[PDB]
Symmetry: C2
Subunit: 287 residues, 2 copies
Amino acid sequence: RIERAERIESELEEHVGDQTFVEESRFLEEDEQREGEILDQIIFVDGKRRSFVRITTDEGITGIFAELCVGAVIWDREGGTKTLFSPDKPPVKERVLGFSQSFQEEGYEEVGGILFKVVKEGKDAMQSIDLYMRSLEIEEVRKHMDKNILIVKDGPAARELPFEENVGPIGLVKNIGVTELSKEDFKKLRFLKKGKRSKMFVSKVGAYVKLIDGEGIRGLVRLETYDDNQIPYIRKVFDDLAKTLPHLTADLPLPENILPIQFLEENLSYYLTDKNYMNTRLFAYIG
Amino acid sequence: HHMQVRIERAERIESELEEHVGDQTFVEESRFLEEDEQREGEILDQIIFVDGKRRSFVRITTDEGITGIFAELCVGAVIWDREGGTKTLFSPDKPPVKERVLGFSQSFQEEGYEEVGGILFKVVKEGKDAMQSIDLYMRSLEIEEVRKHMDKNILIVKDGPAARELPFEENVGPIGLVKNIGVTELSKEDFKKLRFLKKGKRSKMFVSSLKKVGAYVKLIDGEGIRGLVRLETYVKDDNQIPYIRKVFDDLAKTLPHLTADLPNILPIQFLEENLSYYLTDKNYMNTRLFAYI
């Protein structure tokens, strides 16, 4: 019996693992899933990465030349969705060279006149790059904290940035491999009607929200963020997003990749360097 | 001072959803057969190469959370003849082995075959993840394709790792040819010496400890690790070592003549390209799979 299906893009694709569960689910027994409304405005923040060239050093270390582009849109119940950047004021774009933390050096690599920041906090090159784009993302959330508008940030919640009043930020999680719930409860989720939410659970607290119809974890998303007097504040935010987010999507052929977010991702991609151009430039100094 | 990054290999990255590539791995001490020495070899008159090609379609998640992958594997062989170069040991009228598989982790508890849209997929589930299960199955298909040619008294070279299921036999091998040399099986300082091997040169043989024997060979000119492959085989009697030594000498001599240094080795490239012909169109398969799932 099938809960999700996705097309495979290449023969080198991530060996994706089975979903992971826990022995017992840390629910909030008193889960008050009240009804919500519709938010006037949500700010969405996300990042796009482009990967150019993989190298191996003389010490055996694998490195990845990449570029990360991060930014934001405003959604508006009245006023659709718009970019917080423009060709005149382009979103942040950073060239990086990712290594595992086994790489002994630090700073910048100049290849072909272009400086690539060495980024090496992860266990391997690509994880180091993902860790870094997360920090740039956090930085972009920080650029609008005082706007008094709810900020939804693609990916995991940001430990660095705990939950505020009318802002968040709130992590939106599409890939739910590590479920945090147990199997008997997760299994249960698949029968959630388009718009319903689970009971909140905590490690840092989370809730799964369903965004379309038909059973199975497509449309299933998980909201999460990081003083227990804040729970009523954010519990409303969860009650308001489970209302609001289904209206910002639809189905066609993806689902969980919500409309404003796809518009944002399209827009960041516009700013990324052409792959063939960049690779040709880099290869003139590597090979 | 300015940052010194010494690059031994560089490769274009094809998509963003790739399995993470890790650093190369080393061992504390290299177990070289120090008595070994490369001697001049002879160009082989014939070699059979065996390889496989896979095409992945759709990834699924079951209700129990097990990630699954629908795929197809196609396996076959070419014979390379020093007079007549390369031919497929298969043809459109006698097509190579093609199997549709549904890969899962060990955690999958059913078995046999799954039908989807009237198409049978063999459940394949030996591994830790779905793709691992697929790779182990093609390896088993490649081993079967080797067995088919053992009778011919011709050297057989299998793309990928040596197969312990097939210990070295005197004229035939098989010999594994490893081109992805991440787990190096040598110490770092010894591994670093290899980038200086010249074309047609091999390291000394080295041993795993029922034993694997291996040597590195340099197939092209120039001093990085492109062109560096590992030949290896499993050996039963240590008195077979002389015979393996000669094969390694002969492959070290012969294989560089079957490469280009320009933009795999050529016979294998031709094999893979031909195998590819027989694989099912992706748009067709994926649409039918998504419809019936």
